[PDB]
């Protein structure tokens with residue numbers, strides 16, 4: 001007489017042997033990311049433009065190192081011009097169609113890949129200056145600095161060129177998203193082909209440079225301490241490398257775990273539910289890095305704001 | 314193993330028997346298929362050497378709507394659905410007794426809603442052709458007339474020991490997998506002009522049907538970059554309870570054009586007008602078949618709209634929908650099921666019959682013929698299969 | 712056959728009899744042989760009539776032997792006889808609906824003439840037998856009119872209609 005079956009509600013979930021209620025974690029992050037990303041964009045824009053004004057007119061880019069420092073600030077700007085879009089993408093959705101999405105996605109990675117590429121070039125230029133002083137003088141022409149940078153930008157474009165194969169956007173889920181739909185027939189190949197490229201080029205390669213180059217540089221510290229300015233100059237290039245590692249290597253580790261939820265790593269869904277709150281934080285930490293390099297220049301750098309270090313203390 | 318012996322020659326007096334028959338199907342006993350599990354615990358292997366003794370000059374009045382053999386199959390398939398799809402919530406009504414003292418008020422409002430909670434594993438599901446065989450002492454007759462009229466006497470009576478391939482497929486508005494007609498599409502009904510008995514229409518040509526769901530619910534695009542956290546890959550984007558069928562219009566139009574010719578001869582030159590059904594339960598208004606726990610409820614309004622006139626001569630998109638909470642054809646009540654499963658489900662089925670009702674009236678003027686789709690009474694589903702046979706007991710003098 | 716009465720909008724119960732107790736097939740047809748409800752296994756088929764979204768049946772009573780016919784929103788034109796169909800039998804029933812109202816809603820002053828409006832079905836002979844709290848059991852034809860209506864003659868008057876030894880009660884909204 002009183003039957004309790006009247007419910008039109010349904011759940012968009014498949015049938016498995018372990019029910020996993022995965023939380024969207026978009027709204028809580030949408031009340032934290034747009035003001036933070038805007039604050040990064042405020043500090044980042046006025047930060048790097050000062051580093052462009054000072055080197056162009058106050059320093060004079062008289063050397064190959066200053067050329068790489070300029071290009072590193074330009075690489076950060078390519079990162080920065082996409083930041084207000086992603087600020088307005090956690091908050092609501094993707095309102096920009098797709099024709100511009102094959103450019104913005106590329107500009108994100110051109111900012112990313114060239115970012116580590118010129119830091120490596122900064123490391124190699126300072127390594128050559130300390131150990132192979134005869135060889136470095138022949139090859140540290142500003143002319144040679146420019147043509148190296150031009151090649152470096154081209155490679156940075158090609159390092160994002162598989163990402164530009166498909167950027168089509170369709171309404172899937174709540175609102176239109178611009179998710180690259182690479183070919184289905186060779187699906188397993190391309191998916192694994194993307195995790196390694198960020199990790200090798202962005203983590204493995206600069207680690208290999210750091211081991212090799214800073215073992216040759218520290219050898220000078222063991223021999224003599226006669227020149228303080230040579231020791232103090234290494235402090236600038238060393239700080240840039242490790243602050244990059246402090247802010248991007250947590251993402252690189254998690255990015256390997258994101259694809260490898262199979263037998264290689266961890267299989268529990270609750271292990272992937274803590275991981276759902278891990279990928280976004282370390283990506284956000286990476287996002288903040290683009291404003292840190294001018295801040296480093298005002299603290300470590302004894303050529304830009306060296307009088308501010310005495311005035312602060 | 315089983316074994317029975319023939320009868321070289323017997324034509325004694327025939328008497329209608331109501332004995333208990335044993336099934337005989339070709340099982341496998343190794344797979345996780347339910348119909349192979351049920352046939353292993355209760356069915357025997359099929360007869361490798363069947364014998365059909367043809368009786369030259371013998372006639373009998375095969376009534377088919379009073380057949381007690383179909384009342385046994387209907388109680389043998391209900392015993393399979395209690396071993397195949399265990400419902401999560403089996404809500405069934407339960408009343409006791411409330412009367413006053415036909416002369417005194419008949420207000421019976423005392424009824425209890427008993428609910429049973431069981432585990433719901435999504436298991437495989439596929440029918441298997443079975444053979445009902447006669448027990449010791451009885452025999453099963455079989456006509457061989459190509460028309461057979463329903464409840465009419467034939468002349469080519471032959472006796473057998475086991476029936477032909479019978480599938481336990483449960484469906485409404487369109488009879489699925491089964492036997493075809495011999496030479497012409499025939500119609501069967503207990504009484505015409507009754508406007509109450511369903512009209513069984515058996516086809517002579519198999520109309521094919523492919524019912525599948527597209528695997529585009531799960532996303533395969535990866536937003537590798539700024540996002541890759543919220544909209545991450547393998548996230549459901551589509552409806553997981555939606556499918557679609559297709560019917561060959563160039564082939565189905567031929568078979569339907571032969572149905573209207575039979576009706577014209579039977580009902581004296583009327584205007585056959587098919588229509589959609591008049592409402593009711595969603596297992597009656599729509600089509601209903603099963604494929605691995607996926608209970609397709611197919612909208613057939615773009616299949617029965619068309620009206621007909623004389624001088625008669627590609628991919629009909631049939632919109633279906635998987636509903637969890639389904640009515641049980643076995644008695645009253647409902648049964649809530651489990652969420653659907655991961656993968657492509659394809660129903661490469663057949664269409665052998667057609668269940669049709671009739672809308673006759675005397676308020677409506679002299680000529681009209683409305684044939685809405687009916688069915689739902691599963692006893693009528695297997696009366697379309699057990700029409701050739703009859704269980705009769707022949708006493709032995711020995 | 713028996714006869715029941717409707718009250719212009721409520722529900723009515725029309726039951727059949729079955730002593731088999733097997734949940735056998737039933738049907739519901741009018742005098743014009745039009746299907747309204749019917750058994751299909753254990754399922755309910757709303758037949759092609761003008762009572763599609765109105766006819767109802769209690770499925771829990773189907774395994775007992777009683778098959779009701781619940782029709783909501785009873786109109787005047789729905790007055791017709793219905794026959795049952797169980798175990799090859801024809802249990803004939805009958806159904807009559809009618810109504811009664813006024814025309815003046817709230818402006819019924821002290822000493823203002825009263826008017827009624829009886830809505831009786833064609834093919835029937837009703838009989839107005841009202842009851843007043845002042846002891847006025849006024850009987851007459853179908854249309855009744857009283858010259859007197861004051862403050863002391865307000866209230867829900869019980870006007871019932873006797874026809875074929877059957878009667879149902881009603882109320883009258885009077886605002887003075």
Ligand SMILES: *[C@@H]1O[C@H](CO)[C@@H](O[C@@H]2O[C@H](CO)[C@@H](O[C@@H]3O[C@H](CO)[C@@H](O)[C@H](O[C@H]4O[C@H](CO)[C@@H](O)[C@H](O)[C@@H]4O[C@H]4O[C@H](CO)[C@@H](O)[C@H](O)[C@@H]4O)[C@@H]3O)[C@H](O)[C@H]2NC(C)=O)[C@H](O)[C@H]1NC(C)=O
Pocket residue numbers: 436437438439440482489490602603604605654655656657658659660661662663
């Ligand atoms: C009328 O008769 C016709 C015959 O002509 C019937 O058509 C056949 O129907 C069966 C039943 O679906 C079908 O068998 C399936 O074939 C698929 C393709 O070969 C198989 O992949 C499938 O096996 C999977 O599904 C089962 C049930 O879900 C599982 O138990 C099984 O292990 C397999 O499971 C894998 O895939 C599923 C996908 O969701 C996944 O969930 C699992 O984890 C696992 O990965 C079936 O064996 C036949 O192929 C049909 N015949 C043809 C020629 O196509 C028709 O069904 C009949 N009508 C009715 C109403 O039954």
Ligand SMILES: *[C@@H]1O[C@H](CO)[C@@H](O[C@@H]2O[C@H](CO)[C@@H](O[C@@H]3O[C@H](CO)[C@@H](O)[C@H](O)[C@@H]3O)[C@H](O)[C@H]2NC(C)=O)[C@H](O)[C@H]1NC(C)=O
Pocket residue numbers: 365367457469471
């Ligand atoms: C009465 O019913 C019997 C049932 O057996 C009919 O006998 C069957 O008749 C068909 C032809 O109508 C035979 O099919 C043919 O068989 C031959 C030899 O096997 C084959 O070469 C042909 O291609 C064709 O398939 C069938 O074999 C036969 N049955 C048996 C057991 O022999 C009989 O014809 C019916 N009589 C009437 C008047 O309908």
Ligand SMILES: *[C@@H]1O[C@H](CO)[C@@H](O[C@@H]2O[C@H](CO)[C@@H](O[C@@H]3O[C@H](CO)[C@@H](O)[C@H](O)[C@@H]3O)[C@H](O)[C@H]2NC(C)=O)[C@H](O)[C@H]1NC(C)=O
Pocket residue numbers: 527529551552555
């Ligand atoms: C992928 O899944 C989607 C839905 O999950 C399938 O899309 C559906 O396709 C049918 C026909 O192809 C659409 O029906 C048509 O809709 C339009 C607009 O309403 C109407 O004008 C037409 O008359 C017709 O009814 C249906 O709307 C559409 N569903 C959605 C949500 O868009 C699609 O078929 C699947 N992919 C494949 C390859 O099957």
Ligand SMILES: *[C@@H]1O[C@H](CO)[C@@H](O[C@@H]2O[C@H](CO)[C@@H](O)[C@H](O)[C@H]2NC(C)=O)[C@H](O)[C@H]1NC(C)=O
Pocket residue numbers: 462464465466
């Ligand atoms: C097919 O069945 C119909 C009825 O189901 C048979 O029609 C009846 O036949 C008997 C004699 O066989 C007559 O006395 C009746 O008057 C017939 N009734 C009607 C309504 O026609 C018909 O004869 C059967 N055909 C065959 C070949 O047996």
Ligand SMILES: *[C@@H]1O[C@H](CO)[C@@H](O[C@@H]2O[C@H](CO)[C@@H](O)[C@H](O)[C@H]2NC(C)=O)[C@H](O)[C@H]1NC(C)=O
Pocket residue numbers: 504505506507
């Ligand atoms: C099929 O049903 C009809 C009723 O629709 C039966 O016809 C009735 O037959 C009896 C006796 O022959 C008559 O008294 C009635 O007047 C008939 N009713 C109508 C509406 O004609 C018919 O007999 C039934 N046929 C079978 C084989 O059961």
Ligand SMILES: *[C@@H]1O[C@H](CO)[C@@H](O[C@@H]2O[C@H](CO)[C@@H](O)[C@H](O)[C@H]2NC(C)=O)[C@H](O)[C@H]1NC(C)=O
Pocket residue numbers: 523558559628630
């Ligand atoms: C069922 O019918 C639909 C509707 O035509 C078919 O979908 C089309 O499939 C072809 C591939 O042969 C595509 O090129 C069309 O774009 C599809 N149409 C739409 C509207 O999406 C479907 O292939 C049919 N399925 C079968 C098994 O025949």
Ligand SMILES: *[C@@H]1O[C@H](CO)[C@@H](O[C@@H]2O[C@H](CO)[C@@H](O)[C@H](O)[C@H]2NC(C)=O)[C@H](O)[C@H]1NC(C)=O
Pocket residue numbers: 521522523559560561628661
């Ligand atoms: C339903 O599916 C079946 C099998 O997948 C299709 O049957 C085949 O159809 C092709 C051409 O469409 C023929 O060349 C084959 O010979 C057929 N094979 C069989 C076994 O029949 C059928 O065409 C499909 N129907 C629709 C409407 O798409």
Ligand SMILES: *[C@@H]1O[C@H](CO)[C@@H](O[C@@H]2O[C@H](CO)[C@@H](O)[C@H](O)[C@H]2NC(C)=O)[C@H](O)[C@H]1NC(C)=O
Pocket residue numbers: 612613614615
């Ligand atoms: C099954 O399909 C039919 C036909 O497309 C649907 O019927 C329609 O009913 C709605 C609402 O009454 C009307 O607006 C449409 O005009 C009808 N169809 C057409 C094309 O005339 C029916 O709604 C579908 N089934 C369900 C339950 O949605």
Ligand SMILES: *[C@@H]1O[C@H](CO)[C@@H](O[C@@H]2O[C@H](CO)[C@@H](O)[C@H](O)[C@H]2NC(C)=O)[C@H](O)[C@H]1NC(C)=O
Pocket residue numbers: 490491519521662663
């Ligand atoms: C569904 O219809 C098709 C129509 O071709 C049937 O396929 C044929 O069935 C006969 C009967 O056994 C076989 O002799 C043929 O060899 C089949 N043709 C092919 C190409 O395989 C099919 O059997 C029907 N399905 C069922 C379950 O009977």
Ligand SMILES: *[C@@H]1O[C@H](CO)[C@@H](O)[C@H](O)[C@H]1NC(C)=O
Pocket residue numbers: 369370
């Ligand atoms: C059966 O009938 C036929 C009629 O053609 C006849 O020839 C035959 O002898 C009959 N059979 C028997 C056993 O009498």
Ligand SMILES: *[C@@H]1O[C@H](CO)[C@@H](O)[C@H](O)[C@H]1NC(C)=O
Pocket residue numbers: 425426427428
């Ligand atoms: C109602 O159903 C419950 C569960 O089956 C049972 O325990 C209880 O006794 C029933 N009550 C009556 C009055 O039948």
Ligand SMILES: *[C@@H]1O[C@H](CO)[C@@H](O)[C@H](O)[C@H]1NC(C)=O
Pocket residue numbers: 581582
């Ligand atoms: C009805 O159809 C038959 C077909 O044999 C025909 O002989 C007869 O004349 C038709 N009657 C009418 C009124 O058309």
Ligand SMILES: *[C@@H]1O[C@H](CO)[C@@H](O)[C@H](O)[C@H]1NC(C)=O
Pocket residue numbers: 618619
């Ligand atoms: C059936 O088809 C006719 C045209 O032949 C159309 O007018 C009618 O609307 C269709 N039926 C429905 C329910 O849409």
Ligand SMILES: *[C@@H]1O[C@H](CO)[C@@H](O)[C@H](O)[C@H]1NC(C)=O
Pocket residue numbers: 622623624
């Ligand atoms: C049947 O066809 C003929 C000609 O082929 C035509 O004259 C007649 O009108 C048709 N019948 C109806 C009911 O339209």
Ligand SMILES: *[C@@H]1O[C@H](CO)[C@@H](O)[C@H](O)[C@H]1NC(C)=O
Pocket residue numbers: 562563566624625626
């Ligand atoms: C289907 O049958 C009708 C019957 O009149 C005919 O008009 C129509 O052309 C047929 N369609 C096809 C595709 O054969």
Ligand SMILES: *[C@@H]1O[C@H](CO)[C@@H](O)[C@H](O)[C@H]1NC(C)=O
Pocket residue numbers: 678679
């Ligand atoms: C139906 O038949 C009756 C009697 O034969 C006749 O009086 C009536 O006019 C017919 N109806 C039509 C629409 O011709």
